[PDB]
From a paper:
In prokaryotes, the DNA replication initiator protein is DnaA. SirA, a protein produced under Spo0A∼P regulation, has been identified as an inhibitor of DNA replication that plays a specific role in preventing replication re-initiation in cells committed to sporulation. Furthermore, the SirA binding determinants of DnaA have been mapped to its N-terminal domain, DnaADI. Here, we have solved the structure of SirA from B. subtilis in complex with DnaADI providing the first structure of a DnaA domain in an inhibitory complex.
The crystal structure of SirA–DnaADI was solved to 1.7 Å resolution using single anomalous dispersion (SAD) phasing techniques. SeMet-derivative crystals contain one complex per asymmetric unit (one molecule of SirA, one molecule of DnaADI) while the asymmetric unit of the native crystals contains two complexes. A vestigial N-terminal Gly-Pro-Ala sequence inherited from the DnaADI polyhistidine-tag can be seen in molecule D, and an additional N-terminal Ala is visible in molecule B. SirA–DnaADI is seen as a heterodimer, with molecules A (SirA) and B (DnaADI) forming one heterodimer and molecules C and D forming the other. SirA consists of a single globular domain comprising seven β-strands and five α-helices in the order β1-α1-α2-α3-α4-β2-β3-β4-β5-α5-β6-β7. DnaADI from B. subtilis consists of four alpha helices and three beta strands in the order α1-α2-β1-β2-α3-α4-β3 with a β-sheet topology of β1-β2-β3. The binding of SirA and DnaADI is mediated by helices α1, α2 and α3 of SirA and α2 and α3 of DnaADI. Seventeen residues on each chain contribute to the interface which constitutes 12% and 8% of the surface areas of DnaADI and SirA, respectively. In the complex, 1240 Å2 of otherwise accessible surface area is buried in the interface. In the SirA binding surface of DnaADI, Thr26, Trp27 and Phe49 contribute to the core of the interface with residues Pro22, Ser23, Glu25, Ser30, Pro46, Asn47, Glu48, Asp52, Ser56 and Trp53 prominent in the rim. On the corresponding DnaADI binding surface of SirA, Phe14, Tyr18, Gln48 and Ile52 contribute to the core and Glu13, His17, Val24, Leu28, Gln41, Met44, Lys47 and Tyr51 are prominent in the rim.
Residue numbers in the entry:
A (entry chain A): 2 to 141
B (entry chain B): 0 to 81
């Protein structure tokens, strides 16, 4: 099972941390996981808010519904859930505020369906799995 | 003096607050603290490495300008973490 936290990074910070994306991964991992003193956590949260963009919810909804048409999917407001053809896998997409969360199982096609919509919306999505230490840009 | 560097940094933050947007001031500047002034070097404590890096990269000129406007002197600005 894969679990990605995906943020839309501002251009200025993407550029600044080009070739140093591990530092952004560590910032995000500190917010989601690391046991930080309350004040360190609050600074980290403020920083994350600053360097990221709000998810364009209505734009995402439109693009998702077009791409998933006649796929095994359902929508529950900001949650999309899909099952791949021929029983090959499953994935959940959740969008809220500045964060997208994806959970996937089976073939890597499962998350790829969502990543393909995202990468056509912007080159600036950074997807990170804090369980497996897999992270990177969704490259168009 | 110990109280004197606090005064200088508080004055510089108050001027910086009149220059920057609220999100930039609150995110990057507001939690900084004076650490030391020795020779030509003013050392400022940033709350974490991420902040240290961005302050060094983006705000050193602004801080140096602010200190120059307040004192008439050029101070080298350095950032450390706790």
């Amino acid at each position: 099972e894969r679990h990605y936290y995906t943020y839309l990074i501002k251009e200025e910070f993407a550029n600044h941390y080009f070739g140093r994306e591990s530092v952004m991964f560590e910032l995000f991992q500190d917010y989601h996981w690391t046991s930080l003193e309350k004040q360190q956590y609050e600074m980290t949260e403020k920083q994350i808010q600053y360097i990221t963009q709000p998810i364009p919810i209505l734009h995402m909804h439109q693009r998702l519904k077009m791409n998933l048409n006649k796929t095994d999917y359902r929508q529950l407001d900001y949650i999309y859930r899909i099952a791949l053809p021929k029983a090959k896998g499953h994935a959940t997409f959740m969008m809220k505020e500045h964060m997208i969360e994806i959970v996937a199982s089976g073939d890597y096609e499962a998350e790829t369906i969502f990543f393909e919509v995202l990468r056509k919306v912007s080159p600036c999505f950074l997807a990170m799995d804090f369980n497996s230490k897999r992270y990177g840009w969704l490259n168009p | 003096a110990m109280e004197n560097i606090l005064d200088l940094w508080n004055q510089a933050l108050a001027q910086i607050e009149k220059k920057l947007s609220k999100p930039s001031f609150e995110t990057w500047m507001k939690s900084t603290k004076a650490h030391s002034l020795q020779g030509d070097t003013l050392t400022i404590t940033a709350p974490n490495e991420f902040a240290r890096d961005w302050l060094e990269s983006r705000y050193l000129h602004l801080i140096a300008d602010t200190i120059y406007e307040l004192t008439g002197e050029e101070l080298s600005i350095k950032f450390v973490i706790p």
